[PDB]
Amino acid sequence: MNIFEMLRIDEGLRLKIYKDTEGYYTIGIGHLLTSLDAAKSELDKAIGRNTNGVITKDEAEKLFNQDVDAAVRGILRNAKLKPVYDSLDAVRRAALINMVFQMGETGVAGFTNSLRMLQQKRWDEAAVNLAKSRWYNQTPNRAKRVITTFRTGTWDAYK
């Protein structure tokens, strides 16, 4: 199991524009675009071609690669995230990247209390704290998966 496999399971694959769990235009593997026209535009600009709203698997994967790379770099550039990331083992690092991919560096950065818990390796507590969020309430199955990953340090929730 790895980050790519982990996110591909959390986000699914869609070759046709679509609306996200919160109604935003998205495509491929959780590639957030945002108006459909505005979204079509963004999409065209992301792909460099006239897409008419549809992409190939290859195209979705290209975006996905760019996006995982971007999440990692953001983490590493972030003064609040980097120290947490540095203190973690490989599996849990994957869990942090997943959250970033989904909510953005900023969104994750604001889980201040949880972060401190993670940094201090208080597993059970951080799992409980992480659960007290809109994120958990809005996409509970996904959230439960990431949280179990932080709590156990294993890939059991994905297997």
Ligand SMILES: [Cl-]
């Ligand atoms: Cl892009």
Ligand SMILES: [Cl-]
């Ligand atoms: Cl979910």
